[PDB]
Amino acid sequence: FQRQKLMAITAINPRCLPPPPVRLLRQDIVAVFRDNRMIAVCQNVALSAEDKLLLRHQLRKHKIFIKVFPSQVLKPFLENSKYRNLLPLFVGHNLLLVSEEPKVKEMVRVLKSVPFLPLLGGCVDDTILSRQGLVDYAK
Amino acid sequence: LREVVKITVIEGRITETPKATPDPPNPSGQCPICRWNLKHKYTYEDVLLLSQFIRPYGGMLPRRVTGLCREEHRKIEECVKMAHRAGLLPNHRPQLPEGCLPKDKPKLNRYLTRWAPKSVKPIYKKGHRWNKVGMAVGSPLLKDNVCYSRRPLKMMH
Amino acid sequence: VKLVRVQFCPFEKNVESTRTFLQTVSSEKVRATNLNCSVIADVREPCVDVLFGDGYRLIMRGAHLTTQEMLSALASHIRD
Amino acid sequence: GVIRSIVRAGQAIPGPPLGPILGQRGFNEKTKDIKEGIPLPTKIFELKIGQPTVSYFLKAAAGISLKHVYEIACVKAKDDAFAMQDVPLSSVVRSIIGSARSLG
Amino acid sequence: DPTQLTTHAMGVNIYKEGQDVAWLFQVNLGPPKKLEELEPESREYWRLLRKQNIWRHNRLSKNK
Amino acid sequence: FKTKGVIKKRCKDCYKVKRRGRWFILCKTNPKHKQRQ
RNA sequence: UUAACCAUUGAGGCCUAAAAGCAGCCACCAAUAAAGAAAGCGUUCACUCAACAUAAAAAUUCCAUAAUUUA
Ligand code: FES
Ligand SMILES: [Zn+2]
């Protein structure tokens, strides 16, 4: 038995311890703002991929593009740019109606193509405005 | 605290919630338990401590909301089960769906209960002194708790 | 559900839950599923009003209402 | 329900392709406007006029050049349902090139 | 006739109203770009690098 | 409810449960996949 | 230590009218933020995973009695 007897004989948790202490996409967000004079923020309606394409393609025929970026990487430039009131708007899935001409009324008309999709606002002719204001300017 | 009031019109209204006691003894404690220097000093009978993490009907709160670290999210959960089975939380009984009455059988007093009483089979063959089978008492998750005895606590009785 | 009305104010403070709830309503597949309801979107705190054929009108405001509560409320009401 | 069933313009009969979907569930425009004897995609739901398939066009060219490859690409963007509205021509020319290489 | 294809633009006119009457030429004519061909700093290289990563998973996925 | 030494999921819909002191996999789609330890 | 998440044409031709990611056989690509002539599927041609985007991860009858914390 002594053989077994010999065999048996022969401070702060790192948990509580305090823990020791996009660039390409940044250009893309800058590029759309530089290239497109007006950026209209509309909620992404989770449209079908085939239906999403034709709307983008149909706008492409009208030389109008659709641009989408993640919100969290979009916060910095929106904080310091000509467009600063879109930060609360850019929550969740979103899309941008971006063009070269102030076709605000036609933008709603293309938006009216799918009635369920609403418009939240944005900027037209580099002027940031809400939808209620945009409708007045559209007239 | 946001709660729903029904009238049909139903409205959820945010109400003021009790605020946590300031100035924890241990500053910068990563886990709420350690913040208060209760890392290895609480047991099942500490109803006051455990009650701070339990739903009104006896359910456990999610880790995120509570903020406890997983190590203390399992130990706290384990102690809560022992407290319920020992009748230390009489005001957090299950919600009776349709006014159903309790089983009406008298409740046997139990404490330090590791497993559910329904899921434990009797040990008909006890075993001899050398081979004797042990009956579980307490839970292994509380091994690190401070011991004020000469020798370590006997989990298996 | 005979009609569903969702109104929210982008210009004023707008809760995220109602907007996230609204886009689900503003879906072709969802519209087809609830063929009975006439979906109308109002844009101008947020208030959601849904009308039923039997005459029960349910008004839901998103000021402090989470998306799950609205969806759960609608699901239960649809069952009748 | 979108159905992707079409036959050659020269052919004036729906043939096998059209019928099965209707059973499972429960064209003159092409014949005249576009040249006959060439297949073209359609999106019957609402038959829509469509441009001829390039791949068979490539086979027709092969009977089974760069200018021919480019020529088809320029006028290809003539449809909306097709989704063939990519303004940058690189998409179309590269696409047909990738189709030409794969086909024998 | 292969020569007829070059001389006359079949693509431009395919309507019955005609008889195939006759950066555009600067696009790539080469074979499919492999990881070696693609420029390491180009989006296509990283984009098609994901395809190669997808390739391995898809081959394993096919076997199941 | 075959009693086996090792319980292994047979489908994606399969889920695991710990009932009356033993491990169970119950599948809503197929009752065949139901097992016990 | 396991998660719900999204899913783009020139129909690639080929013996299977004709094969769309595809019965089938050879190629296996083109754009795209990001997609395999696809993982399954779908399809005699023509639901979705991977990508992108992603909250997380053995036979007569058991057999001392009992006990979790006083240095
Ligand atoms: S109690 Fe300090 S790490 Fe959790
Ligand atoms: Zn199963």
- The first and second tokens of residue B96, run together, are 């009776």
Q: Are B2 and C70 in contact (CB under 8 A)?
A: no
Place of tokens 């339990």: B54
Q: Are A70 and A28 in contact (CB under 8 A)?
A: no
List the one residue out of C36, C47, C37, C45 whose CA is nearest residue C6: C47
- The first and second tokens of residue D86, run together, are 């990519």
Element holding E2 (H helix, E strand): helix E2-7
Place of tokens 């963007």: D77
Strands F2-3 and F35-36, by their bridges, are parallel
Element holding D28 (H helix, E strand): helix D28-33
What is the spatial distance between Cα A103 and Cα A126, in angstroms, rounded to a whole number? 13
Strands A65-67 and A38-43, by their bridges, are unpaired
What is the spatial distance between Cα A130 and Cα C9, in angstroms, rounded to a whole number? 10
- The first and second tokens of residue B60, run together, are 């456990």
Q: Are D6 and D40 in contact (CB under 8 A)?
A: yes
Element holding B50 (H helix, E strand): helix B47-51
Mutate to test the pocket of ligand 1, among B28, B33, B70 (most ligand atoms within 8 A of CB): B33
Nearest atom within ligand 1 for CA of residue A13: 3
| Helical axes A131-138 vs A104-112, angle rounded to 10° | 110
CA torsion sign, C29 to C30 to C31 to C35?
Answer: positive
**D40 residue type, one letter:** L
Q: Are D13 and D31 in contact (CB under 8 A)?
A: no
Ligand nearest to the Cα of F32, by number? 2
Task: Classify residue B3 by its DSSP letter.
Answer: E
| Helical axes D89-102 vs D66-76, angle rounded to 10° | 130
Cβ of A19 below 6 Å from ligand 1: no
The alpha carbon of C49 is separated from its chain's Cα centroid by a whole number of angstroms, namely 6
Q: Which residues contact B13 (CB under 8 A, 6 or more apart)?
A: B2, B3, B5, C64
What is the spatial distance between Cα A90 and Cα A123, in angstroms, rounded to a whole number? 13
What is the spatial distance between Cα A27 and Cα A32, in angstroms, rounded to a whole number? 9
The order of strands in the sheet holding C47-51 is: C38-43, C3-8, C47-51, C57-61
- The first and second tokens of residue B29, run together, are 């404690």
Task: Classify residue B27 by its DSSP letter.
Answer: T
Q: For A2, phi and psi rounded to 5 degrees?
A: -55, -30
Element holding C25 (H helix, E strand): helix C16-25
What is the spatial distance between Cα B5 and Cα C19, in angstroms, rounded to a whole number? 22
Q: If you count them, how many residues does chain C have?
A: 80
Q: Which chains touch F (3 or more CB pairs under 8 A)?
A: B
Ligand nearest to the Cα of F34, by number? 2
**C39 residue type, one letter:** V
Task: Classify residue A20 by its DSSP letter.
Answer: P
The alpha carbon of B23 is separated from its chain's Cα centroid by a whole number of angstroms, namely 26
Neighboring chain C residues of B14 at a CB cutoff of 8 Å = 64
Place of tokens 């097709």: D82
Hits for CB < 7 Å against strand G across E residues 23-42: 32-33
C-alpha angle B43-B47-B53 in degrees, rounded to nearest 5: 95
Q: Are A138 and A119 in contact (CB under 8 A)?
A: no
Q: Are C65 and C17 in contact (CB under 8 A)?
A: yes
* Partner residue opposite B9 with nearest CB, options C59, C64, C66: C59
Q: In a 10 Å sphere around its CB, with 0-12 CB exposed, 13-18 middle and 19+ buried, how is residue A38 labelled?
A: buried
What is the spatial distance between Cα B43 and Cα B49, in angstroms, rounded to a whole number? 9
What is the spatial distance between Cα C50 and Cα A91, in angstroms, rounded to a whole number? 25
- The first and second tokens of residue B120, run together, are 């434990």
What is the number of helices (H) and of strands (E) in chain C? 3, 4
- The first and second tokens of residue B54, run together, are 């339990």
- The first and second tokens of residue B31, run together, are 């886990």
What is the spatial distance between Cα A124 and Cα A104, in angstroms, rounded to a whole number? 7
CA torsion sign, F2 to F8 to F12 to F14?
Answer: positive
Q: Are B157 and B134 in contact (CB under 8 A)?
A: yes
* Residues E26-60 as b or e (16 or more Cβ within 10 Å = b): ebeeeeeeeeeebeeeeeeeeebeeeeeeeeeeee
Q: Are B30 and B69 in contact (CB under 8 A)?
A: yes
**B116 residue type, one letter:** A
Q: Which residues contact D73 (CB under 8 A, 6 or more apart)?
A: D89, D92, D93, D96, E11
Hits for CB < 7 Å against strand G across D residues 24-63: 24, 39, 41, 53-56, 59
Q: Which residues contact A53 (CB under 8 A, 6 or more apart)?
A: D83
Quick check: A54 and D86 CB within 8 A? Answer: no
CA torsion sign, D75 to D78 to D81 to D86?
Answer: positive
Residue ranges in A10-125 assigned as alpha helix (H): 23-35, 49-61, 71-79, 104-112
Deposited resolution, Å: 3.6
Longest C-alpha distance within chain C, in Å?
Answer: 36
Neighboring chain B residues of A18 at a CB cutoff of 8 Å = 28, 30
* Residues C17-36 as b or e (16 or more Cβ within 10 Å = b): bbbbbbbebbbeeebeeeee
Neighboring chain A residues of C25 at a CB cutoff of 8 Å = 116
What is the spatial distance between Cα B84 and Cα E51, in angstroms, rounded to a whole number? 55
* Residues F4-30 as b or e (16 or more Cβ within 10 Å = b): eeebeeeeeebeeeeeeeeebbbbeee
Q: Which residues contact C35 (CB under 8 A, 6 or more apart)?
A: none
Q: Are A42 and A64 in contact (CB under 8 A)?
A: no
Q: Are E9 and E20 in contact (CB under 8 A)?
A: yes
* Residues D90-100 as b or e (16 or more Cβ within 10 Å = b): ebbbbebbeee
List the one residue out of B94, B91, B113, B107 whose CA is nearest residue B47: B91
Q: For B154, left (φ over 0), alpha (ψ -120 to 50), or beta?
A: beta
Q: For A16, left (φ over 0), alpha (ψ -120 to 50), or beta?
A: alpha
What is the spatial distance between Cα B53 and Cα B67, in angstroms, rounded to a whole number? 10
| Helical axes A49-61 vs A104-112, angle rounded to 10° | 150
The alpha carbon of B34 is separated from its chain's Cα centroid by a whole number of angstroms, namely 18
What is the spatial distance between Cα B43 and Cα B81, in angstroms, rounded to a whole number? 11
What is the spatial distance between Cα B69 and Cα C75, in angstroms, rounded to a whole number? 36
Q: Are B26 and B34 in contact (CB under 8 A)?
A: yes
The total of other beta-carbon atoms located within 10 Å of residue D35's CB is 19
Torsion of CA A122, A123, A128, A134, to 10 degrees: -80
Q: Which of residues 23-62 of C touch B (CB under 8 A)?
A: 56, 58-61
CA distances to A72, B1, D18, E58 from B13, rounded to whole Å, are: 29, 8, 58, 50
What is the spatial distance between Cα A47 and Cα B51, in angstroms, rounded to a whole number? 47
Q: For C3, phi and psi rounded to 5 degrees?
A: -145, 150
CA distances to A27, E28, E41, E49 from E44, rounded to whole Å, are: 17, 14, 9, 8
Q: For A100, phi and psi rounded to 5 degrees?
A: -110, -10
- Chain G: nucleotides below 7 Å from protein CB are 6-15, 17, 20, 26-40, 43-46, 49-54, 62-71
List the one residue out of A66, A117, A71 whose CA is nearest residue A95: A66
Q: Which residues contact D96 (CB under 8 A, 6 or more apart)?
A: D54, D58, D69, D72, D73
